Amino acid sequence: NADNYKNVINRTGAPQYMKDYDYDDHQRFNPFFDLGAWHGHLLPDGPNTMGGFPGVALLTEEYINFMASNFDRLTVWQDGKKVDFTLEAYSIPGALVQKLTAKDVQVEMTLRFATPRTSLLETKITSNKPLDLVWDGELLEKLEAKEGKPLSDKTIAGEYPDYQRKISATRDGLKVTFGKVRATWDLLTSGESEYQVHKSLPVQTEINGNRFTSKAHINGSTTLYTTYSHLLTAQEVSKEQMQIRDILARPAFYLTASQQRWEEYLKKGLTNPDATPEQTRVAVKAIETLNGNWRSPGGAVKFNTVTPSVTGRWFSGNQTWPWDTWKQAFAMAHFNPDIAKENIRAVFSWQIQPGDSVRPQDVGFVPDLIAWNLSPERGGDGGNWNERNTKPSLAAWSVMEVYNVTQDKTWVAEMYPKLVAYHDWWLRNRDHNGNGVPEYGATRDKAHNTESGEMLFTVKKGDKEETQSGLNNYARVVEKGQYDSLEIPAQVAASWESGRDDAAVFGFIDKEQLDKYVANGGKRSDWTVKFAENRSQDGTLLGYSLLQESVDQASYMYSDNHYLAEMATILGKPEEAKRYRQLAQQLADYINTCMFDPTTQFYYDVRIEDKPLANGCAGKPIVERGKGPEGWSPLFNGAATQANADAVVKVMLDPKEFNTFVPLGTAALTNPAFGADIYWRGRVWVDQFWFGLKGMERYGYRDDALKLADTFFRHAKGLTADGPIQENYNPLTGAQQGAPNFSWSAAHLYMLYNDFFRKQ
Numbered sequence: 122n123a124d125n126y127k128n129v130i131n132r133t134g135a136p137q138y139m140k141d142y143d144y145d146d147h148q149r150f151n152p153f154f155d156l157g158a159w160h161g162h163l164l165p166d167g168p169n170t171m172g173g174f175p176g177v178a179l180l181t182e183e184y185i186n187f188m189a190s191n192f193d194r195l196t197v198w199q200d201g202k203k204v205d206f207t208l209e210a211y212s213i214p215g216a217l218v219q220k221l222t223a224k225d226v227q228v229e230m231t232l233r234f235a236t237p238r239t240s241l242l243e244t245k246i247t248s249n250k251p252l253d254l255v256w257d258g259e260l261l262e263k264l265e266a267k268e269g270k271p272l273s274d275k276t277i278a279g280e281y282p283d284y285q286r287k288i289s290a291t292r293d294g295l296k297v298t299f300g301k302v303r304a305t306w307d308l309l310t311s312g313e314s315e316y317q318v319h320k321s322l323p324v325q326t327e328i329n330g331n332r333f334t335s336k337a338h339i340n341g342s343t344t345l346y347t348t349y350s351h352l353l354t355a356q357e358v359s360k361e362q363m364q365i366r367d368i369l370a371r372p373a374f375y376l377t378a379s380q381q382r383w384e385e386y387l388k389k390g391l392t393n394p395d396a397t398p399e400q401t402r403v404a405v406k407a408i409e410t411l412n413g414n415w416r417s418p419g420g421a422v423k424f425n426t427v428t429p430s431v432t433g434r435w436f437s438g439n440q441t442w443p444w445d446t447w448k449q450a451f452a453m454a455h456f457n458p459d460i461a462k463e464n465i466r467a468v469f470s471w472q473i474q475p476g477d478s479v480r481p482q483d484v485g486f487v488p489d490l491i492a493w494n495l496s497p498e499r500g501g502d503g504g505n506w507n508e509r510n511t512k513p514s515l516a517a518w519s520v521m522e523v524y525n526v527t528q529d530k531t532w533v534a535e536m537y538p539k540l541v542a543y544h545d546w547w548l549r550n551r552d553h554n555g556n557g558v559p560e561y562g563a564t565r566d567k568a569h570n571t572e573s574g575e576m577l578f579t580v581k582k583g584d585k586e587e588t589q590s591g592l593n594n595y596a597r598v599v600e601k602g603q604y605d606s607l608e609i610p611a612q613v614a615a616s617w618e619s620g621r622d623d624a625a626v627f628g629f630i631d632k633e634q635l636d637k638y639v640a641n642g643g644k645r646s647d648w649t650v651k652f653a654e655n656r657s658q659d660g661t662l663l664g665y666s667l668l669q670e671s672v673d674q675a676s677y678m679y680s681d682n683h684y685l686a687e688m689a690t691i692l693g694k695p696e697e698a699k700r701y702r703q704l705a706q707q708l709a710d711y712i713n714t715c716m717f718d719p720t721t722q723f724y725y726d727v728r729i730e731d732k733p734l735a736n737g738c739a740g741k742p743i744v745e746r747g748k749g750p751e752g753w754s755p756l757f758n759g760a761a762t763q764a765n766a767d768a769v770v771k772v773m774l775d776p777k778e779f780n781t782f783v784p785l786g787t788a789a790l791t792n793p794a795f796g797a798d799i800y801w802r803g804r805v806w807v808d809q810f811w812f813g814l815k816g817m818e819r820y821g822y823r824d825d826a827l828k829l830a831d832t833f834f835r836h837a838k839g840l841t842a843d844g845p846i847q848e849n850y851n852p853l854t855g856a857q858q859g860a861p862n863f864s865w866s867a868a869h870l871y872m873l874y875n876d877f878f879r880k881q
């Protein structure tokens with residue numbers, strides 16, 4: 122089945138820079154990674170690279186960095202004359218292949234992964250005479266380029282003088298060793314990491330600085346085996362040696378293991394018989410993408426996980442976020458459930474427990490960003506690890522989807538208490554006014570407050586800066602408005618917690634836009650989101666909240682409660698189930714009563730106003746900041762009444778609102794802060810699009826959802842081409858932006874294949 126899907130993504134490339142970046146600093150080629158391994162490979166792009174898989178991509182703890190263009194590239198010689206080949210090269214799901222054809226010699230090379238640190242190359246040589254084989258390779262020297270043009274003349278060795286890369290010959294191949302580099306934002310190594318090449322035949326080797334040439338003589342047709350391993354610690358190096366020996370002893374077993382695992386992914390995943398071949402190919406692209414973004418355990422993360430993009434500037438290594446994970450695992454349940462489970466385990470593995478050394482006031486909290494390296498507060502030197510905030514909680518939904526597929530009650534029993542703890546954390550630490558309806562917010566953190574618990578902020582006016590602390594001081598500063606900007610690190614983190622960090626509803630609007638808003642009769646203060654601290658009965662600072670309750674977050678919590686009730690029932694906990702059903706109903710009541718505006722027929726966030734309203738609502742719906750995808754969150758999550766759903770669907774289908782060339786973007790055309798190229802104020806994301814179609818379907822509008830899915834399929838640029846999957850789309854033009862090989866887009870493209878794509 123895999124052979125039906127050749128070159129789904131363009132995996133060719135010959136990188137010339139460690140950082141061979143696209144316009145947005147992502148690696149501009151798409152290497153093949155599998156089994157959660159920490160290195161990847163490209164296909165040759167022509168004569169200069171044929172005979173090898175160029176562009177060895179090393180995952181250096183938290184970043185993707187190219188090591189070499191040609192490395193272990195084969196050329197073949199007969200009587201001192203080089204054999205001239207023509208090349209066929211292609212990817213399939215789970216392998217890279219190249220075939221070299223000449224009259225009297227042919228070579229077929231197949232590359233698959235064998236372990237979480239090792240790939241296996243089969244070099245099948247057909248020849249009716251003896252041959253001399255030569256392999257060559259060279260480490261990269263240049264540091265950085267953007268769209269193929271150098272950003273500077275900086276060198277790798279110049280930039281990282283301790284990297285001290287060295288090639289050494291071994292008793293069966295060679296190794297590259299690497300010195301310790303703790304470049305927090307760029308390159309992280311232990312000083313014990315190596316890239317190892319082991320082969321099934323003796324070779325002779327000449328090393329010339331950062332290049333090598335190795336040779337062997339064969340008698341005729343033969344199949345050789347080569348392992349390539351990126352090993353990140355001394356312990357990994359030592360442990361891999363027995364695995365390498367086993368692979369070279371029984372290579373057929375490892376090739377077959379990979380073949381069968383991939384056949385299973387495709388068999389389990391490709392289950393929509395109404396899909397066209399073109400739609401099926403998108404599903405396969407999604408599967409390849411998600412599986413490539415899977416990382417095996419590394420560093421502080423003791424579980425397999427999935428990152429948002431192995432090629433991403435800030436998304437690589439094993440950097441893992443919660444709401445990415447929920448979406449990833451929801452889709453991966455349907456083809457790679459073992460890793461869907463692991464990915465969820467990885468996020469919960471650093472959930473805060475009672476007596477935590479850093480934040481004992483945050484029991485149940487799930488960190489925003491976990492990674493190989495712990496932060497200095499937890500004894501590491503990692504700069505990415507983030508506990509300033511979490512992400513929106515679709516955890517129970519994700520866990521339940523794995524259960525729906527596997528029917529494994531032990532999985533529900535494993536996750537239930539972790540889900541309960543998280544649920545409880547939101548209600549303690551993200552409910553400023555104690556009404557059971559959450560806010561996005563931020564933790565107590567070194568970045569957010571002084572050691573005495575006073576909130577930090579920086580008031581900027583022209584080129585003058587003033588850093589102050591204290592919520593009372595913050596209050597006065599907001600009242601007077603004598604600043605160009607007010608930077609509050611806790612409120613930045615709150616925007617991160619929402620997942621949509623420049624959304625209109627959180628106060629973000631450009632100058633020209635706000636000027637027009639004012640000219641039309643609005644006030645600038647309508648865009649000010651106020652901020653508050655959350656304290657326990659005994660006065661302990663628990664964190665912070667926006668003085669605003671978000672309709673998406675309420676709706677996700679509604680679903681959390683619903684899924685927790687379902688799980689409690691499965692686990693024979695009827696009284697817990699009854700309590701969660703009550704909490705769900707109370708949230709649905711608040712969502713419908715408080716967040717639905719009948720005049721504009723849509724749902725919105727509400728402010729937490731100085732005094733609550735007579736109906737118990739914390740404030741009025743924030744209609745004046747315009748409509749966004751949060752307004753269909755009550756439909757997706759099932760909190761909406763039918764009547765309110767009917768109203769929202771009419772708005773979604775309106776070409777003046779959201780029914781655009783690519784429909785269901787992150788702000789309606791009528792939103793005062795709309796911009797077609799703005800990430801969270803117009804651009805279409807696949808998650809929010811699929812949430813909208815699912816919401817439509819839930820309330821009896823599957824036919825209209827199918828139509829929108831067809832519009833998406835026809836208009837989203839690049840969908841049926843061989844480019845990597847990105848983050849979002851211009852709603853007017855369909856043009857793509859964002860990191861290549863983006864996981865949750867893959868996840869929701871797969872779900873669209875499952876749920877809505879079909880032959881017309």
Ligand SMILES: OC[C@H]1O[C@@H](O)[C@@H](O)[C@@H](O)[C@@H]1O
Pocket residue numbers: 198200201202253254255336
């Ligand atoms: O060893 C096979 C071939 O290797 C090449 O690199 C050259 O050294 C050739 O002269 C030789 O015939």
Ligand SMILES: OC[C@H]1O[C@@H](O)[C@@H](O)[C@@H](O)[C@@H]1O
Pocket residue numbers: 435442489490507617618620622
């Ligand atoms: O774009 C990546 C950034 O995304 C935000 O939502 C947070 O998770 C940050 O910690 C992270 O650096």
Ligand SMILES: OC[C@H]1O[C@@H](O)[C@@H](O)[C@@H](O)[C@@H]1O
Pocket residue numbers: 429436442444445512619620621
């Ligand atoms: O993909 C990882 C994270 O990247 C950030 O830039 C935001 O888009 C977050 O919503 C997301 O969770």
Ligand SMILES: [Ca+2]
Pocket residue numbers: 551552553554555556557558559560670
């Ligand atoms: Ca509240």
Ligand SMILES: [Mg+2]
Pocket residue numbers: 496506507508509566
């Ligand atoms: Mg921190």
